[PDB]
């Protein structure tokens, strides 16, 4: 008479790694590294904005492709490769810092700055920004002399932030193709723009010169920006070549910004995104994208790390 | 080996045990039988489940983009970012591999620990009525029928009932 003690086993078990042995068979194991991607943007419960043709910085200045977004509200912002910040040729200075600010802004709220003008034209327009005809940036004003080669007066404009959150302020500097063209638009002589606040101090001079034509235009507008603290004032001093702000921007709250080339899905919910889609996983690690953003598993080099969920597999001695 | 011979856990798993991780297999006049032990099975599963509860979880810390796929950032700051990111990846890749290996080592050991504990418990209740055959089994020196076998499995076996019968059997 005999009584025996034993444990279960399987014909073929999963191989895992330990401290003292590589590829030891266990009864069962589970994966810890996520490789499975959902090729869509899972946005359930999130106010989502798909910028499309509009560039993120465009929502601040307002080219025609960004008209439906001038005061957007969002929890999740999606940039696309075909997005453009401009209509008239140019670029933002310190562009990436501003994009980072706007990606987590929660959207923007625009307020008029109340600038009024005398003895100048405020209706400067171009065929590059076509909005049912020759137009300009929706949030900006292109200031010109009354007539060609007429003198541009020396002006000073100030704006006080009377709200509780900081104000995003943007202005532009116009770079003409020649000194002659600059004289035609703003009159002759050196052109100077000085921008001042309590914690900001900078000056700008246009650099007239020949450039390659973009959409047939050799001129350039360069956009600059600052953050104006509550109860502080920004002062603009200029005699020409100045693209003036019409409205200031205010950040609504909190949001997430991503760059993607895949479709939105309001039916799935996720919190970890990359350009190829959404990582929906409970696993602690992932091997999909090292630049994944949100609340994500940690990126690792390894495709697979199997964790034992059962005992060592020991084959039965032949009967 | 011999006809209708049975062997224990030492250097041997049971591919026929199906309703548990651990169990008993006995041999007597009535025949052979096999039964799973739930308490030990549940205990091993509790420990591994506890381990999995800790491991299968992601952080609540959020991260945002600091570079750009469409328009590349300035070269110098881009190299600092790439160098920092790659350094972090090296750390986590190292941690992950070490963690899994460490846990797997512990899981295998704890599983063999439950087997030993069950083995030791039975050894403790059988007392002087049996001897160890060295393969993870007990040779019982009295008549143990299905009811007697069941008493060993459910921890109600009373060694004092069969002691005198068993001790004479051990001596001659």
């Amino acid at each position, epitope marked *: 008479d005999k009584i025996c003690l034993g444990h279960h086993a399987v014909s073929n078990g999963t191989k895992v790694n330990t401290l003292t042995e590589r590829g030891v068979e266990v009864v*069962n194991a*589970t994966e810890t590294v996520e490789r499975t991607n959902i090729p869509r943007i899972c946005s*359930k*419960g999130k106010r989502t904005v798909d910028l499309g043709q509009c560039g993120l910085l465009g929502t601040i200045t307002g080219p025609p492709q960004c008209d439906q977004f001038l005061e957007f509200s969002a929890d999740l912002i999606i940039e696309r490769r075909e997005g453009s910040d401009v209509c008239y040729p140019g670029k933002f200075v310190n562009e990436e810092a501003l994009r980072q600010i706007l990606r987590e802004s929660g959207g923007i709220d625009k307020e008029a700055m109340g600038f009024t003008y005398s003895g100048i034209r405020t209706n400067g327009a171009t065929s590059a920004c076509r909005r049912s005809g020759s137009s300009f940036y929706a949030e900006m004003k292109w200031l010109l002399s009354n007539t060609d080669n007429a003198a541009f007066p020396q002006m000073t404009k100030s704006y006080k932030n009377t709200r509780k959150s900081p104000a995003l302020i943007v202005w532009g500097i116009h770079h003409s193709v020649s000194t002659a063209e600059q004289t035609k638009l703003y009159g002759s002589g050196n052109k100077l723009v000085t921008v001042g606040s309590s914690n900001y101090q900078q000056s700008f001079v246009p650099s007239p010169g020949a450039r390659p034509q973009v959409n047939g235009l050799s001129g350039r507008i360069d956009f600059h920006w600052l953050m104006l603290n509550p109860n502080d004032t920004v002062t603009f001093s200029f005699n020409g070549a100045f693209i003036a702000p019409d409205r200031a921007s205010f950040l609504r709250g909190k949001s997430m910004g991503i760059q993607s080339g895949v479709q939105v899905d309001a039916n799935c*919910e996720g919190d970890c995104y990359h350009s190829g889609g959404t990582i929906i996983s*409970n696993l602690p690690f992932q091997n999909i994208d090292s630049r994944a953003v949100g609340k994500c598993p940690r990126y690792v080099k390894q495709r697979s790390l199997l964790l034992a*969920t*059962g005992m060592k597999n020991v084959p039965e001695i032949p009967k | 080996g011999l006809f209708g011979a049975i062997a224990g856990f030492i250097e041997n798993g049971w591919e026929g045990l199906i*309703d*548990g*991780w651990y169990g008993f297999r006995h041999q007597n006049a009535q025949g052979e039988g096999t039964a799973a032990d*739930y*308490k030990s*099975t*549940q205990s091993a*599963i*509790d420990q*591994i*489940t506890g381990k*999995l*509860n800790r*491991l*299968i979880e992601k952080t609540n810390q959020q991260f945002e983009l600091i570079d750009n796929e469409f328009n590349e950032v300035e070269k110098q700051i881009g190299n600092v970012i790439n160098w920092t990111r790659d350094s972090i990846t090296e750390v986590w890749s190292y941690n992950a591999e070490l963690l899994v290996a460490m846990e797997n080592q512990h899981t295998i050991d704890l599983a063999d620990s439950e087997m030993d504990k069950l083995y030791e418990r039975v050894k403790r209740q059988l007392r002087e009525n049996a001897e160890e055959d060295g393969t993870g089994c007990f040779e019982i020196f009295h008549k143990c029928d299905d009811d007697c076998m069941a008493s060993i499995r459910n921890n109600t076996y009373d060694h004092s009932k069969y002691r005198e019968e068993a001790m004479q059997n051990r001596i001659q």
Partner: nanobody
Amino acid sequence: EVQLVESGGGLVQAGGSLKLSCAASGRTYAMGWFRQAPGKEREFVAHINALGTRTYYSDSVKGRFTISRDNAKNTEYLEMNNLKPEDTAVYYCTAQGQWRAAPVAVAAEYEFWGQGTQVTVS
């Protein structure tokens, strides 16, 4: 397949108590409770192992809820004390079909789900 049927849900006032029960048909091992509030994902609530010797709870639920089971009746129970408005949801009982080691708070780790019973806290 194992079939699970929830019962005992209802309307109740804040601070009151309720008792949910899950009747299973078929062999169940580890079981648990999940819940879903409108527009949200299925959320872990409680877990009991096959023998009823060990239990696990959500942090938002611990101290107020008690999970239990009766293997004779093949039934699972969720006793809910000190109910709060945030407890309003459809509650689901869950079950696993074999001996298994898996994270209790992960929905995918349970293969059998009930139809759900509504619990509303005023």
